[PDB]
Design a binder for this molecule. Structure first.
Ligand SMILES: CCCCCCCCCCCCO[C@@H]1O[C@H](CO)[C@@H](O[C@H]2O[C@H](CO)[C@@H](O)[C@H](O)[C@H]2O)[C@H](O)[C@H]1O
Ligand SMILES: CCCCCCCCCCCCO[C@@H]1O[C@H](CO)[C@@H](O[C@H]2O[C@H](CO)[C@@H](O)[C@H](O)[C@H]2O)[C@H](O)[C@H]1O
Ligand SMILES: CCCCCCCCCCCCO[C@@H]1O[C@H](CO)[C@@H](O[C@H]2O[C@H](CO)[C@@H](O)[C@H](O)[C@H]2O)[C@H](O)[C@H]1O
Ligand SMILES: CCCCCCCCCCCCO[C@@H]1O[C@H](CO)[C@@H](O[C@H]2O[C@H](CO)[C@@H](O)[C@H](O)[C@H]2O)[C@H](O)[C@H]1O
Ligand SMILES: CCCCCCCCCCCCO[C@@H]1O[C@H](CO)[C@@H](O[C@H]2O[C@H](CO)[C@@H](O)[C@H](O)[C@H]2O)[C@H](O)[C@H]1O
Ligand SMILES: CCCCCCCCCCCCO[C@@H]1O[C@H](CO)[C@@H](O[C@H]2O[C@H](CO)[C@@H](O)[C@H](O)[C@H]2O)[C@H](O)[C@H]1O
Ligand SMILES: CCCCCCCCCCCCO[C@@H]1O[C@H](CO)[C@@H](O[C@H]2O[C@H](CO)[C@@H](O)[C@H](O)[C@H]2O)[C@H](O)[C@H]1O
Ligand SMILES: *Cc1nc(C*)nc(C*)n1
Lengths: 17, 152, 553
């Protein structure tokens, strides 16, 4: 489910990216 | 436009501080009524408090009924209707006890193929209905306050 | 105080002539039992019914065990089975011990899925699509509650017998108000989903969500800000079979965290209604809500206990689109509603009307969107709901509710009912239920839209009447008519004569009982029976059919 360049500091954005 | 902002509190000033009494005070309905009463700035007291002459809210029987509202062409259920009825009394001390009640209606379509999910949905509906029971009980408070004056 | 009861008799098209021979047993002050031979002529045998009521410190409980050792009809229609025995086990328990302990049991077990279509409906119904098997033990104090629960379901349909069950389940809530201006809640859950089939995925889910809210209130206004933090963790096993056929691969281990932001507001306006009714007051109540939840891809998570929810006026303001915790749709929406109420001179509510809509700024996508919408609208004012409840007098009253969806491009569901009830002995009611075929196609399973008994939808008009005669009789009737097929669905008649000591009752009911797919039509059932017992009993007569009467006031 996690994307490629996802970040754990970007929860508020779509797909944490 | 004759409209204006509401100037009177939803709960009357006489019942600003009051006692919540019930045989199941850790139940969902007691929690919902306590949350609503704290929402309108009502000060809830303990049952065995030494403070007399305050209005007391006693929550009575609560019954939830899930029946069939509609059926398909094969006779199987389609709509499940859930009805919550709640009875309570408001004791104005030295004056009278006034009975009040609340009735909440809900409906949802059954689905056996995801029946467990539907069961979770049913539980969610119950947690809404208690809130609907608590909203209706609060709005009937000024009805009791008006009836107190009519006693004279 | 223990002895035989008066026999009960019945004639049914499914059973031909039936006979009951009940025997009461007063075991103790808190326990009693009933043994009922139930002789059936078409099946030509005696079903033993054992009924047991008990009251204990744990709570109140009912148990029922019905056993038919042999069956002629089931043997004829299942000639290849080992045995034709039929049975039912029912157990209901509700209790609260020592103010903190909660015990709940609702267990139903049947030998075969055609049990309730062939036998009495004391603790089940032919309309039931499955049997529920729930155990719950909880501890609840004023700011805490934990619950260990087990849920299992016996699905009656032979189209596909594959139902998930959460055998362990642990619900934990912790509340702590007045932490400064904010109120705090935390919700925890641990669930294990296991399936009846051996080739389906099995899951362990752990869920934690803190919630912090700031309420603000005045005499006229209310604003509630809420921030919630959902975190779910899935361990999925036994997923080779699912991955062998589907393109979307279920992942072995997943975890997903979402912040949810909610703003609720409401106002109250009041005016005097002297122009129409002097002394009456009218209240206009606007309400608005903003909900934001970012999109997470749930394609690799199987849907265990997430389903679409109804969108009633009050359902417009929910923060969840699906129940459970498998599917959580991303939301960027504002919902608005207005409620108008009227109060008489005694401050009693006599009328209320509500209307609302849900505006989506972006499409609510969950990564596994397979709902078959009629058209392709994704944003805008997409959902409309409306409710009304008018109390015309002390003996009159009507309710109405309508739901419109632009994605279905149609009124999804509506209902209405008007009642004249002077008392429980004498009353009249008319109600109407509607559910469009597009909604059935969108929400229900795929095969519902193609099946003849499901694809049409729901459209029924029901009438219920009750009138005493010479205050010893009580005539009761009900009729339900499906306008799509132009066919009867359920009707009944009841006549009871109540004397000083004995009360005789005669009841008739014809109901939809099943679907004959050899010819593609419906199979009905007739039942005329008399029972004797040692008020005028209108209310239990109204509850004796598959579509029981409900008070509308
Ligand atoms: C509390 C709710 C349930 C209602 C329970 C009412 C139970 C009592 C019903 C009595 C019905 C009339 O029947 C009355 O009882 C039984 C037969 O039934 C007979 O009683 C006799 O037979 C019973 C059969 O078990 C034996 O216990 C015993 O030999 C004797 O008591 C009486 O001679 C008859 O007059
Ligand atoms: C349908 C659209 C709805 C629009 C919004 C609805 C109206 C919202 C505003 C009315 C509610 C806010 O009402 C507010 O209540 C709080 C809580 O007691 C009162 O008390 C407040 O005082 C100050 C000043 O605001 C706040 O910083 C503080 O947190 C709170 O204690 C405020 O004096 C009153 O302004
Ligand atoms: C009680 C209080 C109630 C508060 C009510 C008002 C709350 C408003 C919250 C902000 C509303 C949404 O805020 C803003 O809306 C725009 C407008 O579509 C949306 O923006 C999105 O849609 C626009 C519309 O084409 C596109 O450019 C694009 O798809 C994206 O930007 C986002 O959702 C957000 O950028
Ligand atoms: C389809 C919706 C119709 C809504 C009707 C609202 C008006 C109520 C019925 C009006 C027609 C019948 O006309 C009258 O109604 C009143 C209203 O209680 C009832 O009549 C009675 O009224 C009051 C209290 O109700 C009694 O104390 C009085 O002794 C008697 O006259 C009877 O029913 C009928 O005599
Ligand atoms: C604003 C709040 C108050 C409104 C809510 C209370 C009133 C609600 C009325 C519900 C009762 C009438 O119910 C109404 O039945 C009709 C006729 O079947 C349905 O309408 C349907 O009619 C036929 C199919 O049967 C089609 O030609 C039509 O396109 C379809 O919509 C409506 O979708 C439903 O709303
Ligand atoms: C307060 C209690 C009463 C609430 C109101 C109850 C109103 C009665 C039910 C709504 C009307 C149903 O009445 C009937 O509905 C059906 C299907 O829905 C409509 O539709 C029917 O006719 C149309 C074309 O004529 C065809 O598609 C088909 O034969 C059938 O669907 C009928 O034209 C209407 O006569
Ligand atoms: C307030 C009302 C109280 C209820 C009033 C009526 C209750 C008694 C209902 C008796 C039902 C039996 O009478 C009915 O006759 C019709 C006549 O076609 C036949 O029934 C058949 O045709 C009728 C219409 O013609 C269809 O609606 C029905 O679905 C079909 O089975 C059956 O013979 C029986 O279903
Ligand atoms: C699953 C996941 N992965 C990343 C990198 N970030 C988030 C928020 N979630």
């Amino acid at each position: 489910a996690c994307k490629k360049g996802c970040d754990w500091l970007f929860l508020w954005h779509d797909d944490c990216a | 436009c004759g409209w204006h902002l509401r100037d009177t509190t939803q709960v009357p000033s006489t019942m600003k501080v009051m006692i919540l009494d019930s045989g199941d005070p850790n139940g969902p309905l007691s929690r919902a009524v306590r949350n609503q009463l704290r929402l309108n700035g009502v000060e809830l007291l303990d049952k065995e408090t030494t403070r007399k002459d305050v209005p007391s809210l006693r929550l009575g029987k609560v019954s939830i009924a899930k029946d069939t509202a509609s059926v398909f062409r094969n006779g199987q259920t389609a709509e499940y209707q859930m009805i919550m009825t709640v009875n309570a009394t408001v004791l104005i001390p030295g004056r009278d006890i006034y009975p009040i009640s609340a009735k909440v209606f809900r409906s949802f379509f059954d689905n056996p193929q995801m029946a467990l999910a539907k069961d979770n949905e049913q539980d969610m509906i119950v947690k809404e209905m208690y809130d609907r029971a608590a909203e209706q009980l609060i709005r009937k408070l000024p009805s009791i306050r008006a009836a107190d004056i009519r006693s004279d | 105080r223990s002895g035989f009861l008066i026999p009960n008799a019945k004639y049914t098209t499914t059973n031909y002539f039936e006979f009951y021979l009940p025997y009461y047993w007063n075991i103790a002050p808190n326990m009693d039992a009933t043994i009922t031979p139930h002789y059936m002529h078409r099946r030509g045998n005696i079903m033993w019914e054992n009924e047991f009521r008990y009251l204990s410190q744990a709570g109140a409980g009912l148990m029922e065990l019905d056993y038919l050792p042999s069956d002629k009809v089931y043997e004829d229609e299942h000639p290849n089975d080992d045995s034709s025995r039929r049975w039912l086990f029912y157990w209901n328990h509700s209790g609260v011990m020592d103010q903190v302990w909660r015990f709940n049991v609702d267990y139903t077990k049947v030998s075969d899925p055609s049990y309730f279509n062939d036998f009495d409906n004391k603790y089940g119904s032919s309309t039931d699509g499955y049997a529920t098997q729930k155990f719950s033990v909880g501890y609840a104090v004023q700011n805490f509650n934990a619950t260990v629960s087990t849920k299992q379901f016996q699905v009656f349909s032979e189209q596909n017998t594959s139902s998930y069950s959460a055998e362990p389940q642990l619900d934990v809530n912790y509340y702590q108000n007045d932490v400064g201006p904010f109120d705090t809640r935390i919700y925890g859950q641990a669930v294990h989903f296991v399936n009846t089939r051996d080739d389906m995925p099995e899951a362990t889910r752990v869920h934690l969500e803190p919630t912090i809210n700031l309420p603000l209130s005045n005499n006229w206004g209310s604003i509630n800000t809420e921030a919630k933090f959902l975190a779910t963790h899935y361990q999925q096993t036994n997923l080779d079979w699912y991955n062998s056929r589907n393109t979307t691969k279920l992942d072995e281990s997943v975890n997903r965290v979402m912040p949810q932001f909610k703003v609720d507001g409401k106002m109250v306006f009041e005016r005097d209604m002297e122009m129409l009714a002097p002394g009456y007051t009218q209240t206009l109540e606007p309400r608005a809500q903003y909900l934001y939840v970012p999109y997470r891809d749930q394609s690799d998570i199987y849907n265990y206990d997430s389903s679409l929810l109804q969108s009633d006026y009050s359902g417009l303001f929910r923060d969840r689109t699906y129940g459970g915790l498998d599917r959580i749709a991303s939301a960027n929406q504002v919902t608005t509603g207005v409620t108008s109420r009227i109060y008489d001179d005694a401050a009693v509510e006599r009328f209320n009307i509500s209307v609302g809509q849900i505006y989506y700024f972006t499409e609510s996508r969950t990564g596994d969107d397979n709902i078959t919408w009629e058209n392709d609208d994704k944003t805008g004012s997409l959902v409309w709901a409306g409710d009304t409840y008018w109390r015309i007098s002390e003996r009159w009253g009507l309710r109405g509710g309508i739901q419109y969806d632009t994605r279905l491009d149609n009124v999804a569901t509506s209902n209405s009912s008007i009642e004249y009830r002077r008392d429980e002995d004498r009353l009249v009611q008319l109600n109407y239920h509607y559910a469009s075929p597009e909604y059935i196609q969108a929400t229900l399973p795929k095969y519902y839209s193609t099946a003849e008994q499901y694809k049409n939808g729901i459209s029924q008009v029901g009438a219920v009447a009750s009138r005493p005669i010479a205050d010893r009789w009580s005539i009761v009737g009900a009729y339900y008519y499906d306008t799509n097929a132009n066919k009867q669905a359920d009707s009944m008649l009841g006549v009871q004569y109540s004397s000083c000591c004995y009360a005789i009752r005669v009841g008739y009911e014809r109901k939809l009982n099943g679907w004959d797919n050899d010819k593609q039509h419906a199979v009905y059932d007739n039942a005329i029976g008399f029972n004797i017992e040692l008020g005028l009993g209108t209310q239990e007569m109204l509850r004796s059919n598959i579509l029981p009467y409900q008070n509308t006031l």
